[PDB]
Write an enzyme that holds these catalytic residues in place. Structure first.
Site, PDB file in Angstrom:
ATOM      1  N   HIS E 138       0.918  -1.419  -0.111  1.00  0.00           N
ATOM      2  CA  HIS E 138       0.003  -0.130   0.172  1.00  0.00           C
ATOM      3  C   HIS E 138       0.772   1.204   0.061  1.00  0.00           C
ATOM      4  CE1 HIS E 138      -4.331   1.239   1.191  1.00  0.00           C
ATOM      5  NE2 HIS E 138      -3.635   2.152   0.450  1.00  0.00           N
ATOM      6  N   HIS E 140       0.909   5.005  -1.739  1.00  0.00           N
ATOM      7  CA  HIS E 140       0.346   6.113  -2.501  1.00  0.00           C
ATOM      8  C   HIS E 140       1.771   7.040  -3.229  1.00  0.00           C
ATOM      9  CE1 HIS E 140      -3.574   5.564  -1.316  1.00  0.00           C
ATOM     10  NE2 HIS E 140      -3.342   5.187  -0.114  1.00  0.00           N
ATOM     11  N   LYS E 221      -6.744  -1.795  -8.679  1.00  0.00           N
ATOM     12  CA  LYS E 221      -7.265  -1.239  -7.429  1.00  0.00           C
ATOM     13  C   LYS E 221      -8.694  -0.781  -7.406  1.00  0.00           C
ATOM     14  CE  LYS E 221      -6.414   1.089  -3.157  1.00  0.00           C
ATOM     15  NZ  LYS E 221      -7.841   1.064  -2.925  1.00  0.00           N
ATOM     16  N   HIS E 223     -11.096   1.473  -5.184  1.00  0.00           N
ATOM     17  CA  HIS E 223     -11.380   2.254  -4.000  1.00  0.00           C
ATOM     18  C   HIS E 223     -12.714   2.618  -3.943  1.00  0.00           C
ATOM     19  CE1 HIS E 223     -10.353   5.122  -1.145  1.00  0.00           C
ATOM     20  NE2 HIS E 223      -9.037   4.855  -0.995  1.00  0.00           N
ATOM     21  N   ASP E 225     -13.725   5.766  -2.772  1.00  0.00           N
ATOM     22  CA  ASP E 225     -14.007   6.935  -3.720  1.00  0.00           C
ATOM     23  C   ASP E 225     -14.146   6.974  -5.122  1.00  0.00           C
ATOM     24  OD1 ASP E 225     -12.726   7.398  -1.022  1.00  0.00           O
ATOM     25  OD2 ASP E 225     -11.455   9.160  -1.742  1.00  0.00           O
ATOM     26  N   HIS E 250     -10.129  -1.525  -1.466  1.00  0.00           N
ATOM     27  CA  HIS E 250     -10.442  -0.639  -0.314  1.00  0.00           C
ATOM     28  C   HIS E 250     -12.156  -0.525  -0.483  1.00  0.00           C
ATOM     29  CE1 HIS E 250      -9.285   3.414   1.644  1.00  0.00           C
ATOM     30  NE2 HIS E 250     -10.562   3.414   1.826  1.00  0.00           N
ATOM     31  N   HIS E 276      -6.155  -2.717   4.578  1.00  0.00           N
ATOM     32  CA  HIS E 276      -6.570  -2.407   6.106  1.00  0.00           C
ATOM     33  C   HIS E 276      -7.903  -3.202   6.519  1.00  0.00           C
ATOM     34  CE1 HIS E 276      -8.857   0.000   3.154  1.00  0.00           C
ATOM     35  NE2 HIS E 276      -7.863   0.578   2.986  1.00  0.00           N
ATOM     36  N   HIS E 324      -9.278  11.447   3.154  1.00  0.00           N
ATOM     37  CA  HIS E 324     -10.412  11.382   2.362  1.00  0.00           C
ATOM     38  C   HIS E 324     -11.304  12.591   2.232  1.00  0.00           C
ATOM     39  CE1 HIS E 324      -9.218   7.182   3.153  1.00  0.00           C
ATOM     40  NE2 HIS E 324      -9.447   6.799   1.707  1.00  0.00           N
ATOM     41  N   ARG E 340     -15.952   4.256  12.169  1.00  0.00           N
ATOM     42  CA  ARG E 340     -14.462   3.822  11.630  1.00  0.00           C
ATOM     43  C   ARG E 340     -13.527   3.831  12.849  1.00  0.00           C
ATOM     44  NH1 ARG E 340     -13.172   5.872   5.514  1.00  0.00           N
ATOM     45  NH2 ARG E 340     -11.094   5.356   6.324  1.00  0.00           N
ATOM     46  N   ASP E 364       0.091   2.306   3.718  1.00  0.00           N
ATOM     47  CA  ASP E 364      -0.672   3.270   3.349  1.00  0.00           C
ATOM     48  C   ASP E 364      -0.301   4.677   3.445  1.00  0.00           C
ATOM     49  OD1 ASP E 364      -3.057   4.821   2.377  1.00  0.00           O
ATOM     50  OD2 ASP E 364      -4.464   3.359   3.477  1.00  0.00           O
TER      51      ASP E 364
HETATM   52 NI    NI Z   1      -4.667   3.575   1.102  1.00  0.00          NI
HETATM   53 NI    NI Z   2      -6.706   3.892   1.441  1.00  0.00          NI
END
Ligand code: NI
Ligand code: NI
Ligand code: NI
Lengths: 99, 114, 571, 99, 571, 114
Positions: E138, E140, E221, E223, E225, E250, E276, E324, E340, E364
C-alpha cells in the site's frame, strides 16, 4: 514378453540352428554361418542348462570335426565369440578353433 | 516372506479427510436408464431426472474414496453421504447452472436462486 | 470414512510404511514420506477425479504451473531424498514440482507448482516406480545401435568417444581432433540419447588440447594405448583447470613410465575420473584400487566383473586378448594378463561398492563391458552384498533403502556430478530436465515400461501396433514419438565445454540438438558425490594381490545364481 | 506373400515357441518370455484350427501349471494378451492368470 | 583444541544454542543450526583466512561458483527455515548459496555453490543480522522522497500507484490509463527501489482494464472514492484471472452498494488482496475483519494502528478528515467516522497478527500510514503480544523464533507471494535476487547498517565523507554506488504483467530498469502464505463493534511505552 | 537477562577440528624485525630467516583458531602446533617453492625438492 533388442536378435541365430541340424541329418557339409550357428546355440543352451564357462567352451569344440564341414571352413574360424545368459548373468564364450 | 512384487502391508486402516461436515441424502433414479456418478462430480449440477433435496448439495461432492463411482439402477433408491469441496470451493462447467462462487453462509442457507 | 490398505494398494498404490520387494532380490524399499492429504488422490480414467471442473481448470497454460504431463502418484527412488510417494509434474521438458496435483480452487493442500488443467496428459503412476535415467561415463562409440540396448535398460545419457569400429576406437573412448569431433557431434543428431564427447588427452603442448575444447569435448581421455605418461596427464589436467571439464584416465598397466604412486604425484591433487578402478579394464597393476583412497579421485567401475561370479575368472582371460589386441602366443602379451586377471580385487570391488568407496558405475561398452545390463548389474550386486555383509549401521532396522539409494546414486546423480551436468540431469529434483524411467517393481532394474526424455516418451514397451491395445504380444521395445522427427533432437542434449558454447559450436557445427555447456567439474571432490563420501586407508599386498582396507582383508566368496537374469531374459 | 508388418512380427514369436517346447521336452522350468511364447502360440494355432474365443481362452489356461515354470513367473503374469486371425477376423485373446 | 564461546562470540559471532536479544524488546532468537565445520571459519582482515592460496584461489570467475560478494558468518532471519548461522554467497546479483565459504582445494566441507576467489569482496557478517528486504503493498505515490525514508528502515520494494500530490492520489493508489502509467514507469527510472504500479479497477467493460494491463500494471485497485461496486470488483477479478495479476481492495465503508457479505459474493471465491483489514483505512464498516476468515482473501494491514497505544483513539478523528477530504461541519461526514474509529477492532488486529490470521503487513503511506516505521512497528507489536498473550503452543520452550519468523514473513515473503514476485524476492533462498538488509541486533528492525540491492549496496549508514573512516559523526544515511548512475536502474526492478512484458513495454516505454513479469497471483490462497495459514470462524457484534474469534472475545489492553522509539529516534 | 543486542551463549566450549594429526615445532626468529604468521598461511613457504624443521611442515598450517595470528619478536623462540590443510590439500602461490599438492605419501615423508 518385453523383449529387449539383445533378445530379439538372439532368435534369428536360433532359426539358423534348426536349418543347420536339419541339413546335418541329411548328411551335408556345413558352411560358415551354419557351422557358427550350431556352435553358438550349444553355448546358449549350455548356459540355460546351467553349465559352467569351462564346460561349454570345451563342449562347443567337440560338436563338429573337419569332415563334418566344407573344405576351408576350419581355416577361416580360428575363434568363435558369443554372449549367453548364465545363472550368474551374461558371460562371454570364446571357442578357440573348434575344428 | 512375500511373493515377487508383493507388499508387506502394515496392519493399520487408512483415515479419509476428517473434520469436514457430512450430509446424507436419498437419491432415486426416476428415469428408465442407469446413472453412475463419480467421486468429485458436483451433485447440484447432475441430471434433473434424479429426485432429491437439490438445495442441500450446494458445492458438495460424494463422501467416498476418490476415483470410484457408485451405480444407480432404474427405480432403485440409495442413501449417499456428501462432503464439501476443498480449497477456494470455486466450481465451473457441468450444466451452466451456477459456474462459480460459493454458497456457505454462516447461519442462513440463502443466495443463488434456481 | 475408513477403508483397508489392501483395496487402497490395488487402486492408488502404496503409501507411508509399505515395503516394496525389488523383483526376485532380497531387497525391500519402505516409503519414508507421503506428500498428499488423504481423500483427494488424483488419477485419470473413466469417471475419475481428473475431469472438467474437478482436477482440471479453466485458467490458461501461461499461468506458470499448468503441467504438460503428470505422473499420478508414483514411488520415487532418488538418491537425494528418495523412497517417497508423490505426484510429479512436468512442464517445458523440466520437473515443475513433486508433491500433490489437481485444482487448488476446489481441492485443499494442492502444491502451488503442481496444478492439472487443460494442458496436462496423465500417466498411470500407481503400482509403478519412477527414477532418474542412467548415465554411462565409459562408452566406446563403436556402434550407434548400442544406444537402443542402453535405452532398453534405463540409460538415456552417454559419455565417451570414438569414430566407429576402428581398433583405435575399439580400445579407447576418443574422438581426436576438431574434424572427427564435428563429424561425431553431427552424427549424434540421429541418436536418441544425451552425449558427451571425450577428446584425446595425450600431448606435451597446450594447443592440441585447446583445439578439442573449442571443437566441443566435455573432457579428455588418457589411455595406456595412446601413452598414459606423467606429462600427458599434467597437460590434460592443466587444460581441464582453465576449461572446467573432466579428464577420464585408463592408466599405464605396464608400469612403464612409473608406478601408481608416481601417477598420483603427476595428478597434483586435481580432480580426475578413473575408469575400471578394479583393474580388469586397465590401470597400474596390481594396486589400482589404491587410487580410490584419495579425495580428488572420482572412482568408477566396468560392469563385466560386477557381480563377482564363480565363472568370471575363465571368461576374462580370453576377453582381454581382443579389446587391446594382445596375442595368445607372445609371452610378454599373455604374462602381462596373468596379473590383470587377479580375482581378489574383483571381490573387493563388490564390497567397496557396499562400503561407499567406489562412488560411481560405468560399463566400457563393446570393450570389456555391457551397455544393456547396467541398472541390472547394480541391483545384482546389491542382492549379493546384502546376503553376505548384512544390513549396514547407517541402514534402517526394517528396510534396505540406504543400500538402494547408495547404489542408484552410482548410475544417476554421481556420474552427472563427475561430468559437470548435475544441474541438467542426475536426480528427480525441481527445475531439472525430465529424463525419467518407469518400471514395475516386478521388473525393476531390468525391463522398464517407458523412458521419458524432456517430457516426451523416447522409448517404451510396445505390443502389436495393429492390435486393439498396446499390451498384446509380440511386446518388443520400439522408438516412440520422442525419438521421431525433429523431436528427437529437441529432447536430446549434446554436452560440450563452455569455450565451445561461447565460440558458437551449435551454429558452427550446425546442431539442431539442445546444447548445454558442462560446469563445476574441477572444484568437486568425493564428499560432493552422493552416498559415497568415504576415503578409507588402503594396504595392498603386491605378491598375492590381497587387498586390506583399514587393516581388514576386503573380499567375498563368489555366487553361482544371481538375481534377475534367465528368469526374465531369453538369450 | 505380401507379408504386412503384423505378419512379419508374428514369426519371431513362433521362433521362440519351438525353443520353449524343445526345453519342455528336456525337462526345464520355463521363464517369462518362454511361458508367454507357448501360451500365445496355442491362441494363434487355435484360431487357425477354427476354435472359438471361449475355447482358446480356457485351453491357454490349461497348458502349464506352477510346477512347469520357475518360482515367481506366475506372480508377474496376472494376464496374457495376443491377437490371432480367426475365421471371422482378428480377435483379442485375454488369458487371466494361466498358472 | 578447545576455547570458550565468550572469545569465539567476540570474533566469529554466535552459533548453535546462542540466543540474541532483539534490541530493547523481550524477544530472544536462538540459532536452530550452524552450517559450518568448526575450525576453518572464513573472515576478511589483516592476516586472516581470506588471502592468496588460503580462502581465495587461482581459478577463473566463469567457473560457476566464484562469488562477487560474501557475507562472513551472519545470523539469517528468514521465514522458511531462518535463525541459522551460515556464509551467504552473492553472484550475478542473486544468491548463489547459503552454507560455508572458502577454497575447497585446501579446506574440508566447503559448499560447492560457495567458493571465495579473486572476484569476491567480503562483508563483516559477524555480530550482525541478515534478512530479506521489506515490501510495501500500500504505497500512494505522493512524493518520490518517500522511498528514501522507506529504504532507511529496510524496505527496498514498493507496490501501489499515483501521479503525485493530487487529491486523487492522496486517497487512492492508482495510476489510471496508459499515459499516466508510461509516465510513472518512466519516472521510476530515478528511484532506488523495486516498483509495482496498480491501475484503476473501476469499470463495467473489459477494455479499460485491458488497456492498463498491456500498458504495464502489476494489478488493479478498487477504492470506495472511485466506487467499490460489485461490478467494479467482479469485472476486475475476471480480468485478473486472464492476466495473472493481483487486485487490491478498499471496500465501500458507507455500505452503499451492499454489506460485506454482498461483496464476498461478488468476489466469487477468487483470490484478492484486502487493504486495512481492521477498518481505519477503509472497508465495509463495522465487520470488515470478517473478510479475513475466508481462504481466497490475502489480509494486509496499515501501520498507524499497530501497536495499539493508549493515545491512538484521539489522533484518528483528526487524521481521517484529510486523507479522504471529509468535512468536520457536515453531519454525514463526521458521523461516518464515529463508526470507523472503533477501538475494539484495533486491539483484535494486534492479537490476530499473533494468531496468524492477518497474513501480511503494509502501510498506506502519506494517507493513514508511515513508510519509514514498517519493520519497527512489526517488532513493536511482537513485544506487546509476547508480554500479554505469552509464548504460543507452536513456539519453542526457550526461544521466541516462531513469533519473529511469523512476523518477518508478513513484510518479506507474504507480500511477495501476494503480488506474484516470490521467485524474484521474498526470502533468503538460493537462486533468488540479492535484496538484503543488514542490522546490528542492538538496532534491529529500526536502523540498518547497509541495504544490498541486486548484489550492490544501494543505501547505508555513512559518516563524514572527508573523514579518515566511515564511522565519524554526523552519521546520516546517504545514497551509495547501488543508487548512482546506470547501476540504480540495473539493480532495481519495474514489475509488470506478462501481457505487458510480451507486448514489449521495456522497449515501447524505454525502461533501462530491469523488467520482470509477475505470476502465480490467482492460484495462491491463505495456506500458501508462510506462517499465517489460519482461517478461523468469526462472529462480530454490530452495535458495540465487539469481535469474537471461535467463540472467544479477541481484544487486549493498550500500552503507553513501546519498544524502540525515543531511545533511538530524535524527532 | 542480557543487555540490548547481547548474546546468551550456552555454558559449553567450542571444539576445533579433531581426528587430524598434530606436529609441534620450535620456531626461532633469527632476524632483527618481528614476524607474525596467520592461521591458514602455509608454514613450509615462510621466510628463510625463521630457523626450524622445514621438511616437517609439508602442507601444514597453524593449529590455532582461524583468522588469529601469533606474533614472534626478534630472537624469541616459541613452540607452535601445526595441522594439515583440508579438502584436496593442493596449495598455490606464497614463494614458488612447491605450487601444488602435498601428497599423503604412502608412509614416508618423501617426494619433491627442497
Ligand atoms: Ni490507502
Ligand atoms: Ni486507503
Ligand atoms: Ni577402456
Amino acid at each position: 514378453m518385453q523383449l529387449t533388442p539383445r533378445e530379439v536378435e538372439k532368435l534369428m541365430i536360433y532359426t539358423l540352428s534348426d536349418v543347420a541340424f536339419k541339413r546335418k541329418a541329411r548328411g551335408l557339409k556345413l558352411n560358415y554361418p551354419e557351422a557358427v550357428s550350431i556352435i553358438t546355440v550349444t553355448a546358449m543352451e549350455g548356459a540355460r542348462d546351467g553349465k559352467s564357462v569351462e564346460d561349454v567352451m570345451k563342449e562347443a569344440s567337440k560338436v563338429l570335426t573337419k569332415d563334418d564341414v566344407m573344405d576351408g571352413v576350419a581355416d577361416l574360424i580360428p575363434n568363435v565369440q558369443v554372449e549367453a545368459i548364465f545363472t550368474d548373468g551374461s558371460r562371454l564364450v570364446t571357442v578357440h578353433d573348434p575344428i | 516372506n512375500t511373493p515377487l512384487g508383493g507388499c508387506i502391508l502394515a496392519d493399520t486402516p487408512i483415515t479419509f479427510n476428517e473434520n469436514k461436515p457430512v450430509t446424507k441424502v436419498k437419491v432415486r433414479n426416476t428415469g428408465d436408464r442407469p446413472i453412475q456418478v463419480g467421486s468429485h462430480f458436483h451433485f447440484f449440477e447432475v441430471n434433473r431426472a434424479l429426485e432429491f433435496d437439490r438445495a442441500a448439495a450446494y458445492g458438495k461432492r460424494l463422501n467416498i474414496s476418490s476415483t470410484t463411482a457408485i451405480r444407480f439402477e432404474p427405480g432403485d433408491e440409495t442413501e449417499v453421504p456428501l462432503i464439501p469441496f476443498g480449497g477456494k470451493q470455486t466450481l465451473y462447467g457441468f450444466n451452466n447452472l451456477v459456474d462459480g462462487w460459493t454458497g456457505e453462509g454462516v447461519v442462513p442457507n440463502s443466495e443463488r436462486p434456481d | 470414512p475408513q477403508i483397508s490398505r489392501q483395496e487402497y494398494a490395488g487402486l492408488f498404490g502404496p503409501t507411508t510404511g509399505d515395503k516394496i520387494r525389488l523383483g526376485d532380490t532380497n531387497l525391500f524399499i519402505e516409503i519414508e514420506k507421503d506428500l498428499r492429504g488423504y481423500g483427494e488422490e488424483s488419477v485419470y480414467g473413466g469417471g475419475k477425479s481428473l475431469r472438467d471442473g474437478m482436477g482440471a481448470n479453466n485458467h490458461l497454460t501461461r499461468d506458470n504451473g499448468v503441467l504438460d504431463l503428470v505422473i499420478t502418484n508414483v514411488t520415487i527412488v532418488d538418491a537425494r531424498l528418495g523412497v517417497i510417494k508423490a505426484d510429479v509434474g512436468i512442464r517445458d521438458g523440466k520437473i515443475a514440482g513433486i508433491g500433490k496435483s489437481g485444482n487448488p480452487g476446489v481441492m485443499d493442500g494442492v502444491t502451488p507448482g503442481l496444478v492439472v488443467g487443460v494442458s496436462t496428459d496423465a500417466i498411470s503412476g500407481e503400482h509403478l516406480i519412477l527414477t532418474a535415467a542412467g548415465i554411462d561415463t565409459h562408452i566406446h562409440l563403436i556402434s550407434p545401435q548400442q544406444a537402443y540396448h542402453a535405452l532398453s535398460n534405463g540409460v538415456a545419457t552417454f559419455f565417451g568417444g570414438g569414430i566407429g569400429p576402428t581398433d583405435g576406437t575399439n580400445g579407447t573412448t576418443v574422438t581426436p581432433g576438431p574434424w572427427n569431433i564435428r563429424q561425431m557431434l553431427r552424427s549424434v543428431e540421429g541418436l536418441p540419447v544425451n552425449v558427451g564427447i571425450l577428446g584425446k588427452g595425450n600431448s606435451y603442448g597446450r594447443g592440441p588440447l585447446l583445439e578439442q575444447a573449442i571443437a566441443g569435448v566435455v573432457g579428455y581421455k588418457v589411455h595406456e594405448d595412446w601413452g598414459a605418461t606423467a606429462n600427458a596427464l599434467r597437460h590434460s589436467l592443466r587444460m581441464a583447470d582453465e576449461m572446467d571439464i573432466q579428464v577420464s584416465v585408463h592408466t599405464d598397466s605396464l608400469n612403464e613410465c612409473g608406478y601408481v604412486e608416481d601417477t598420483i604425484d603427476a595428478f597434483e591433487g586435481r580432480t580426475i575420473h578413473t575408469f575400471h578402478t578394479e583393474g580388469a579394464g586397465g590401470g597400474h597393476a596390481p594396486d589400482i584400487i589404491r587410487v580410490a583412497s584419495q579425495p580428488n579421485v572420482l572412482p568408477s567401475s566396468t560392469n563385466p566383473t560386477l557381480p563377482y561370479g564363480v565363472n568370471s575368472q575363465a571368461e576374462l582371460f580370453d576377453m582381454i586378448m581382443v579389446c587391446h589386441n594382445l596375442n595368445p602366443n607372445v609371452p610378454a602379451d599373455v604374462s602381462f594378463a596373468e596379473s590383470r586377471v587377479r580375482p581378489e580385487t574383483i571381490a573387493a570391488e563388490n564390497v567397496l561398492h557396499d562400503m561407499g568407496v567406489i562412488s560411481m558405475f560405468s560399463s566400457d561398452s563393446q570393450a570389456m563391458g555391457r551397455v544393456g545390463e547396467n541398472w541390472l548389474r547394480v541391483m545384482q550386486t546389491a542382492n549379493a552384498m546384502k546376503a553376505s555383509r548384512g544390513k549396514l549401521p547407517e541402514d534402517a532396522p526394517g528396510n534396505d533403502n540406504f543400500r538402494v539409494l547408495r547404489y542408484v546414486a552410482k548410475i544417476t546423480i554421481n556420474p552427472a556430478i563427475a561430468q559437470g551436468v548435475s544441474h541438467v540431469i542426475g536426480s528427480v529434483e525441481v527445475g531439472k530436465m525430465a529424463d525419467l524411467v518407469l518400471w514395475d517393481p516386478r521388473f525393476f532394474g531390468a525391463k522398464p515400461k517407458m523412458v521419458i526424455k524432456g517430457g516426451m516418451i523416447n522409448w517404451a514397451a510396445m505390443g502389436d501396433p495393429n492390435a486393439s491395445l498396446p499390451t498384446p504380444q509380440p511386446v518388443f521395445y520400439r522408438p516412440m514419438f520422442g525419438a521421431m522427427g525433429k523431436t528427437m533432437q529437441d529432447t536430446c542434449v549434446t554436452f560440450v565445454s563452455q569455450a565451445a558454447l561461447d565460440d558458437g559450436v551449435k551454429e558452427k557445427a550446425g546442431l539442431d540438438r539442445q546444447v548445454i555447456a558442462v560446469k563445476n567439474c574441477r572444484t568437486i571432490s568425493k564428499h560432493d558425490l552422493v552416498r559415497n563420501d568415504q576415503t578409507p586407508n588402503i594396504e595392498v599386498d603386491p605378491e598375492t594381490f590381497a587387498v586390506k582396507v583399514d587393516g581388514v582383508h576386503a573380499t567375498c566368496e563368489p555366487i553361482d545364481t544371481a538375481a534377475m537374469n534367465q528368469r526374465y531374459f531369453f538369450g
